Amino acid sequence: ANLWERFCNWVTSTDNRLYVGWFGVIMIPTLLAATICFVIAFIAAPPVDIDGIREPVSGSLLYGNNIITGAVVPSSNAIGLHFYPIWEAASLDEWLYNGGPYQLIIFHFLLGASCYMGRQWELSYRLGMRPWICVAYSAPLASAFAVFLIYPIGQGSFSDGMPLGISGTFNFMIVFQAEHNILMHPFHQLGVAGVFGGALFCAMHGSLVTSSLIRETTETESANYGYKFGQEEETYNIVAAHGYFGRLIFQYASFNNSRSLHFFLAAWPVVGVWFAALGISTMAFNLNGFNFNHSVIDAKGNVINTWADIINRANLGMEVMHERNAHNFPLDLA
Amino acid sequence: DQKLGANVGSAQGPTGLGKYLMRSPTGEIIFGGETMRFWDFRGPWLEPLRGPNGLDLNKIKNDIQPWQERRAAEYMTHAPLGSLNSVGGVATEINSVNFVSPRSWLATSHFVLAFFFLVGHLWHAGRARAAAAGFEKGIDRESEPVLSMPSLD
Amino acid sequence: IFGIAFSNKRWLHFFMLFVPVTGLWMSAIGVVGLALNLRSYDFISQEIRAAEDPEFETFYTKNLLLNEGIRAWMAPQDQPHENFVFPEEVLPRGNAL
Amino acid sequence: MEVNQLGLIATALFVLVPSVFLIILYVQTESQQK
């Protein structure tokens, strides 16, 4: 074998402790750059003029933040969707003021995480597996694309991308509610059904398999020792599990087929989260939640408030207060 | 505000940036407030006010025609914001205007379609690979590839 | 792919019980605190700094401004027994909006 | 910043006490007969 042939054999080797592969050739450097920049920025970055109004917001630990308040702050509204790599700045000091780290991080991250998804297909192929784990990962990935790329595109600025920080995330959520009434949007509602249901079914499946473990141990040892890695025989009794759950509800509401059950476990959260991602990605173009403001009117024409109108009052509070020095004109159009 | 007597070139906003007019990061004169992000916008109703250096203050002061005012007012009040039930405007707006921009309908629908088509691509590309190699129906119990591989540790 | 993996099916399935169940139990404890208004509302160090330094801003201080808007704008209709009348002039608002 | 002056010891013991409990248990497991 020549050098290229050998290199290819190593890259695609099924024997590396962590699989590299061709997607990994892009994933490794991009994820390392994003990680390193993030860590350094989160600790040490100076304040960033997120809203382009010369009002710098401090995100880093050394500049007065704790783990909860800290963030890498989105790039300046003055930049908008302009590409702002380090070399476009006159200095690192300028780059930092304008939120250059945010762009470097999210672009390397999105590239790296897309390659992470490809890499999941890639290894499944090398191991002779079925290929669709990567399709499940497309759900959180799509969600990351929605908040870091698609929303900024629709609104015309990376300053409206989700901040890389715990409190910045909450800021993004509250402002999103004000501007899109996301709670009243059916795609976010499907998302909630996806994650509440995902958690429910996770607990359900956990509890049912755990409930029907076949006795292989004594009381002075963990029942976990009753299963040995790679054993051929199933470790629980699915017939007893189905016997239980089918009586809890009724026979035909319970799965007796493990393949069907596990498919449902994959599908429910993944589809819901795809809708969550699509909610963000379509509210990115301002097709917003249901608006029933003043929908109910009496015989004279008096407005009779519903809970929708109370939501509206909360939303107004968010709207009027957010970015309190950034608006000069009466309508918030992006 | 200029009709009312404001000098829109020298009007300093609350932040120190021009209330109506400011510079882009490369110096072009652009509209101020949040729309600073949109300075790359180009449109027939706006372009006559554009000079070599961006928005021209002398053109702004002297050359704005009624058709430009009308168009800007029309476009401002038909912004592509609206609810799923087609109530036009911001999310806190009251019922009254039945409007969602065709631009929003067309962008959202095509994002959803493009996204699910990427999913279909992954689904079918991964399946085509597996079927071609002969393991799309599962792992052969008597020829499980991982069982012939050395342990990772 | 990830560096670690389950090797024990019994552990895997117990963990699937543990995680969402423990999460829900934790959220319940927080709500018991909220029954008493015993909130995690503030970071005191943040407030002391921001009160003395009008240039100090974090996403934490930004979210409190949003909260103050929510409270003032929703309370009169959301809490009708209080008979709140908040004149236009007292309502917290940023510029223009 | 005007932080709570007990936050440091609170955090350090919060980590150390249970971590140490686990290390003690782990090491004495390892030292048991194979």
């Binding site: - | - | - | 910043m1 440091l8 955090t11 350090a12």
Partner: peptide, 30 residues
């Protein structure tokens, strides 16, 4: 001191990842 604490805990977690991956008990088929 707070910053040191936060970074210290983070650094321990990263070290933990290293040991949990490269120095895990190996899975063995019985």
């Amino acid at each position: 001191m707070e910053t040191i604490t936060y970074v210290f805990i983070f650094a321990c977690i990263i070290a933990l990842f290293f040991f949990a991956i490269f120095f895990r008990e190996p899975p063995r088929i019985t």
